[PDB]
Design a protein around this ligand. Structure first.
Ligand SMILES: Nc1nc2c(ncn2[C@@H]2O[C@H](COP(=O)(O)OP(=O)(O)OP(=O)(O)O)[C@@H](O)[C@H]2O)c(=O)[nH]1
Lengths: 316, 50, 71, 56, 50, 71
């Protein structure tokens, strides 16, 4: 009412800025009708980089192409993609990409995507590359909210609800960008922390031998029990529940948490991870923390949870 | 006198025990790291020729 | 006599069933989950706990955590 | 395969780690036994080429 | 050292074992040079017969 | 700061002399002399503190320990 100051932080590459987009574009100031202006170049770059990285990792993982002739195609690509402009996908590119994806050898590498680094949304994109390459394509809103870009600077967002004045800040999730968090620490009313549920068998970009769940837990425990934010409250968010639902059956939980036992379901391990993410709080009854699942690309759950969050902020 | 020697040799059993378990922990603390560094360096010296 | 357990052949067991064997150790990491409440002998070795780096670099703001938000 | 302990007690958790680190090291060590064969083939190919040069 | 106390026996043995391993592991970099010379000599002598 | 020893800034010694530096070790013999004294914590490791592999090879007659003179 008088003022509300929200800060968004969490592990890098967790979908923090997807919430900023899913709020601003959907609700206040209207959507971006001329979305192509940026989305063309952005999606073209993403779809090119993904299929470049997969073929670069093919040699490292020693998987051999399904067919002999395929060995030629990739080479051509790696030569003809260097001298191309940005935000352009000529037919010579699309034909090669579709032919390469039409193989039983690349599937072997794509099944094991934990070892190396690829963008997660790319698996949805490239399958319909033709839809992009056809002239006049204007992206769908679901396709609009699955783009990817590095949230780097501090940006002010003004949500509106319950007749309040809102100011939302967000910051980069890399180690270097963590210095900038100190400026916005002073004089806040609430804090929001973001966690990605899918990343229990991955590694950091900066450091190749550090797990991601452990990194998130160590980041959380530091500010959770600090006295600078004793007065304020903390709101926890869980993203990427869809890929979590997909993956959780594929691989065990023993790799991340060594002493787990049982059989994994979409809900059996959820309470496991939540209780292990909330035990770190020192003040057991002095302060309370709330965590909610969330699919950032969707809008139904966003509407379900954001209004309740704002109401809980109001209640105090 | 000698009685004080008897007293010392009687009440030194509560320190012969405290000081000895403080010594074993140090040896354990060093052996663990000596094993670990050899294993992790052997991981990285057998990856490629260079 | 009979060793007070009344068994002489070999180890006996109440249960029966199919054997279960262990999986190999494929991937390794330098990291462990943050520490629990209580500690015992042999749980302070440098380099065997944490993320391999001091907490200062991961959380720079925690450096001067003594001074409050006034400044 | 390891077939019997000397104390009399069965194998337990510590012995598995002790006898698994050794096999991990010996498994990683085959790079040298591959490089050996690669050098032993390069040498022979060089000798054959030298003889073919010498004839002409 | 990061405790304020000087090095002693149990920190001499650890870093002596580390350097012993590093000294033994110099066999690999030499074979790299031997390979990169054998291959070139083979190429020269195979281009002489053509 | 009393410090209980009246010294600050660095350790002190009764006497000083020219430095002496340790020498390397080359031979690294396997075996050890037979063991005497009280045991204490931290001993009886199987592989170490022993000569060769087993007693039997060193003294082949020692197998007939329980037997008397006459046989
Ligand atoms: N499949 C799936 N992907 C998601 C979901 N939520 C977020 N993402 C992914 O998150 C990406 C956007 O996250 P980022 O742009 O990296 O935003 P961020 O969390 O602030 O991380 P940085 O930008 O690196 O600071 C999108 O490209 C999506 O692929 C989800 O619910 N499901």
């Amino acid at each position: 009412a008088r003022t509300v100051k929200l800060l968004l932080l969490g592990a890098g590459e967790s979908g923090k800025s997807t919430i900023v987009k899913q709020m601003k574009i959907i609700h206040q100031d209207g959507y971006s009708l001329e979305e192509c202006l940026e989305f063309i170049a952005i999606i073209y770059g993403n779809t090119l980089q993904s299929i470049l990285a997969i073929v670069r990792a093919m040699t490292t993982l020693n998987i051999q192409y399904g067919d002999s002739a395929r060995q030629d195609d990739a080479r051509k690509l790696m030569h003809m993609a260097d001298t191309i402009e940005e935000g352009t996908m000529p037919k010579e590119m699309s034909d090669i990409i579709q032919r390469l994806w039409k193989d039983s050898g690349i599937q072997a590498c794509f099944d094991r995507a934990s070892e190396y680094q690829l963008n997660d949304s790319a698996g949805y994109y490239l399958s319909d590359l033709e839809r992009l390459v056809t002239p006049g394509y204007v992206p769908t809103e679901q396709d609009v909210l699955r783009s990817c870009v590095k949230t780097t600077g501090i940006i002010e967002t003004q949500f509106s609800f319950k007749d309040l004045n809102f100011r939302m800040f967000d910051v980069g999730g890399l180690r270097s960008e963590r210095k900038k968090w100190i400026h916005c620490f002073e004089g806040v009313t609430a804090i929001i922390f973001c966690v990605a549920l899918s990343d229990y068998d991955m590694v950091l970009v900066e450091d190749d031998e550090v797990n991601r769940m452990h990194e998130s837990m160590h980041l959380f425990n530091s500010i959770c029990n600090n006295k600078w934010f004793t007065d304020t409250s903390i709101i926890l968010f869980l993203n990427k529940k869809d890929l979590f639902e997909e993956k959780i059956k594929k691989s065990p939980l023993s790799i991340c948490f060594p002493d787990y036992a049982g059989s994994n379901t979409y809900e059996e391990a959820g309470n496991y991870i939540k209780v292990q993410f909330l035990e770190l709080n020192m003040r057991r009854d002095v302060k309370e923390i709330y965590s909610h699942m969330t699919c950032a690309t969707d809008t139904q759950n966003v509407k379900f949870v954001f209004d309740a969050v704002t109401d809980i902020i109001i209640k105090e | 006198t000698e009685n004080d020697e008897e007293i010392l040799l009687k009440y030194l059993n509560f320190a012969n025990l405290i000081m000895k378990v403080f010594h074993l922990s140090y040896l354990h603390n060093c052996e663990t790291r000596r094993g670990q560094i050899l294993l992790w360096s052997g991981s990285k010296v057998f990856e490629e020729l260079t | 006599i009979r060793s007070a357990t009344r068994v002489m052949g070999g180890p006996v067991t109440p249960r029966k069933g199919p054997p279960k064997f262990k999986q190999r150790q494929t991937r390794q990491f330098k990291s462990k989950p943050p520490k629990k409440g209580v500690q015992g002998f042999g749980d302070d070795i440098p380099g065997m706990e944490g993320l391999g780096t001091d907490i200062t670099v991961i959380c720079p703001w925690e450096a001067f955590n003594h001074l409050e938000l006034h400044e | 395969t390891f077939y019997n302990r000397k104390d009399g007690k069965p194998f337990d958790e510590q012995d598995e780690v002790l006898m698994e680190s050794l096999t991990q090291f010996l498994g990683w060590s085959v790079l040298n036994t591959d490089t050996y064969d690669k050098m032993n083939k390069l040498e022979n190919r060089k000798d054959i080429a030298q003889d073919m040069v010498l004839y002409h | 050292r990061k405790d304020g106390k000087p090095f002693d026996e149990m920190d001499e043995t650890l870093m002596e074992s580390l350097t012993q391993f590093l000294g033994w592991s110099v066999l690999n970099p030499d074979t790299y040079e031997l390979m990169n010379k054998l291959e070139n000599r083979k190429d020269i002598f195979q281009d002489m017969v053509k």
